[PDB]
Amino acid sequence: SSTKNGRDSESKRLGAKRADGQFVTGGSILYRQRGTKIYPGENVGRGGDDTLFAKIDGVVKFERKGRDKKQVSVYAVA
Amino acid sequence: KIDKNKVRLKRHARVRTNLSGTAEKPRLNVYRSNKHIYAQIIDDNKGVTLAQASSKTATKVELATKVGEAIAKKAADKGIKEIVFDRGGYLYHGRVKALAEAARESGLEF
Amino acid sequence: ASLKSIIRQGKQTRSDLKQLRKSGKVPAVVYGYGTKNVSVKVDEVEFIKVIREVGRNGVIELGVGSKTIKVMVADYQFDPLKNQITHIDFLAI
Amino acid sequence: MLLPKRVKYRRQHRPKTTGRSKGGNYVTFGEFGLQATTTSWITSRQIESARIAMTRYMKRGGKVWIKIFPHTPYTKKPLEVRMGAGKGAVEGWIAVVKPGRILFEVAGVSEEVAREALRLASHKLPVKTKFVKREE
Amino acid sequence: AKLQITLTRSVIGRPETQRKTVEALGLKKTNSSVVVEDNPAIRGQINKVKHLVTVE
RNA sequence: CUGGUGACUAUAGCAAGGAGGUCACACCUGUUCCCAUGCCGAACACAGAAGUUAAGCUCCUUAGCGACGAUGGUAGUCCAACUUACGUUCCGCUAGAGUAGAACGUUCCAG
RNA sequence: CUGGGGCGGUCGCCUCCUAAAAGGUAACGGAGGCGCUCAAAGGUUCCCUCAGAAUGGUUGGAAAUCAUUCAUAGAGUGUAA
RNA sequence: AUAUGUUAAGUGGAAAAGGAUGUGGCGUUGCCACA
RNA sequence: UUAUUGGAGGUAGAGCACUGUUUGGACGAGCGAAUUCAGACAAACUCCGAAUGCCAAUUAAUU
């Protein structure tokens, strides 16, 4: 009366790492994902693991890229 | 029948991502046709056109070269040194290739 | 037979709607031409009587805002468990 | 015996059983219907028992419409077993009936004989019923 | 200077979220009173603990 | 209005009935040449008579299909009493329906 | 380890559900995969656009190939999700 | 204790499908007779 | 801890545009599941979508 289920994998902590309107550094991670849920806006790169990081300092803002898509940008202070 | 102009704009979007502003600016745009060849220099972020000069013999090949020297002087009046070339969707050969080599020799490095 | 109706102002709380459905009244809305979605109240037993006379697709001489307006019944919600209506819509012509 | 020919997963979580019915609150196909005023599970075996007892009273009068269907399967472990060591095995197929859903529909008969047919079908089901008609 | 809040019911058996709202108003003991000036920020606090305090 | 090039959840699209013209975009003649088809100068790119606005393009008209959609009521629900299924208060869907809707449009060219 | 022990089963890694719209979250709860392959199946600059349905054509259904028309992906993406 | 109604079962102070001229409250509607 | 503002995230509910399931009609495509008109179901379905909760501002009071 044994079973064949019961195995799972370790959880990979994904999602947003910085809020909206927050000040970030020049190498901070903005989003972990599998695929492209959020596209890289201006002043934001894209890693080899589809990670979204910021290139410069400033405030981070989430925008909309057309219909049923969105992006995230970084603007310098002042 | 197939429209050559409407399928041309599709290829312009595939190249407009890598060079416009992200690579360099201002952007030199080329618009070819079966009767005349045009050109103009645009700003990406501001969204304004700086200079403009176009062709309007030999079915627009030497006149395609003529735009290269005319734009280069219009690019030297206001003063710009570094530029980025936008093919516009056409292959870099022939009429459009002659327009680039003309502006390059006239003190306008790409 | 004519729908003698009164008005209700402000935002009616959830309790007063339950108290309205028990005293024998039914809420309604007139959203025709120029009426500006005026919320209106109406009796229950006097609505079933008039629609039997004229019909489901007949006009009504409803009195709202102390004036006569010719309106018809567009759609209404019905609770099947207690065999009675809960809401009426009036599309003025 | 109503049961789907194939399902994606044989073992599923049991339904909620609490709340109110989504649809099927009015009579659309037939004329005289049968409402429900209590929540319970209607096994497929209880449907064939009520359908035979209903269409028999109407030898060849009219048509009957079954409005529900046993999509969800339930399981039960064998006899004399402790807890755990996996899940059970499929034993039947059930539906979820909430207050307001029409169970059966009858047309092609008179009003006096529709009440007697839908009465014998209500004693076979574990819920309470109410004779309803088409809405004006 | 126009609102006075006194504590009627006790905080035993209440969620910890509601215990921080009473501490943010200055009500330590039972039947204690404070004087505060009305504003959108102070009004929303007693609206959270309405069943524990009464306002005059 | 004629073009070039951008920014904006199809209120920008589909679908149909009409008016367009050799200055401008095209339709079109030919492979000498630059280059080209795992065969085809049809599409890529050179060289260009006449002819047609038939088609693309541009423009008017229409609510057939898509897309935008309040007010009211309902479902659900935070907190709070009764208590286990019912009151009170706050927030407030989906669907559906009266309406929007046959785009806006910054900067450079030729009349 | 174990709804007392023995017998049976299982022990590391990966993907989804259970999980209560951030993240995290158990049970001998419900379903699958891995212990490798690629010398181009990597890099780069150019150029293309699908599976199906339908009228015929050497006729096995008009989809073993060949042509026209529709086709927001119903195809593909070395290998589970 | 006060005002205003309900309930005859000791209900309160233990249980369901189902059965019934127990008794109140608000309605629907056809004969204006049933005996 | 409240007030105001902004954003990330698809549960409750609902729905049939996707995958799977399903009842009765019309209609030659095989004649309700290849098309059509009505009506239903879903932890591993989603064209849609709350209430709460969470991260922030260096925005205001109270502590």
Automatic annotation (TrEMBL), chain B:
Keywords associated with the record: Ribonucleoprotein, Ribosomal protein, RNA-binding, rRNA-binding
Gene Ontology BP term (one): translation
GO molecular function terms noted in the UniProt entry: 5S rRNA binding; structural constituent of ribosome
Family: Belongs to the universal ribosomal protein uL18 family.
Function of the molecule: This is one of the proteins that bind and probably mediate the attachment of the 5S RNA into the large ribosomal subunit, where it forms part of the central protuberance.
HAMAP family assigned: Ribosomal_uL18_B
Designated name of the protein: Large ribosomal subunit protein uL18
Record lineage: Bacteria, Bacillati, Bacillota, Bacilli, Bacillales
Gene name per UniProt: rplR
Automatic annotation (TrEMBL), chain C:
UniProt keyword list: Ribonucleoprotein, Ribosomal protein, RNA-binding, rRNA-binding
GO molecular function terms attached to this record: 5S rRNA binding; structural constituent of ribosome
CDD domains: Ribosomal_L25_TL5_CTC
One GO term of the biological process aspect: translation
GO cellular component, one term: cytosolic large ribosomal subunit
Superkingdom to which the source organism belongs: Bacteria
NCBIfam families registered for this protein in UniProt: bL25_bact_ctc
The protein's name in its UniProt record: 50S ribosomal protein L25
High-level lineage: Bacteria, Bacillati, Bacillota, Bacilli, Bacillales
Gene: rplY
TrEMBL record, chain D:
GO terms assigned for molecular function: rRNA binding; structural constituent of ribosome; tRNA binding
CDD domains the record matches: Ribosomal_L16_L10e
Biased amino acid composition, Basic residues: 1-19
Top-level taxon of origin: Bacteria
Keyword presence, Metal-binding: no
Residue span of region Disordered: 1-23
UniProt keyword list: Ribonucleoprotein, Ribosomal protein, RNA-binding, rRNA-binding, tRNA-binding
GO cellular component terms, A-Z: cytosolic large ribosomal subunit
Pfam families: Ribosomal_L16 (PF00252)
An annotated GO BP: translation
PROSITE patterns: RIBOSOMAL_L16_1, RIBOSOMAL_L16_2
NCBIfam families, per database record: rplP_bact
Family of this protein: Belongs to the universal ribosomal protein uL16 family.
Subunit structure: Part of the 50S ribosomal subunit.
Role of this protein: Binds 23S rRNA and is also seen to make contacts with the A and possibly P site tRNAs.
UniProt-recorded name of the protein: Large ribosomal subunit protein uL16
Species: Staphylococcus schweitzeri
Gene that produces this protein: rplP
From TrEMBL, chain E:
GO cellular component: cytosolic large ribosomal subunit
Keyword Ribonucleoprotein assigned: yes
Any single biological process term in GO: translation
Xref: InterPro entries: Ribo_uL30_ferredoxin-like_sf, Ribosomal_uL30_bac-type, Ribosomal_uL30_ferredoxin-like
Keywords from the named record: Ribonucleoprotein, Ribosomal protein
Example GO molecular function: structural constituent of ribosome
Record domain Large ribosomal subunit protein uL30-like ferredoxin-like fold: where: 3-53
Family listed: Belongs to the universal ribosomal protein uL30 family.
Subunit record text: Part of the 50S ribosomal subunit.
Protein name according to UniProt: Large ribosomal subunit protein uL30
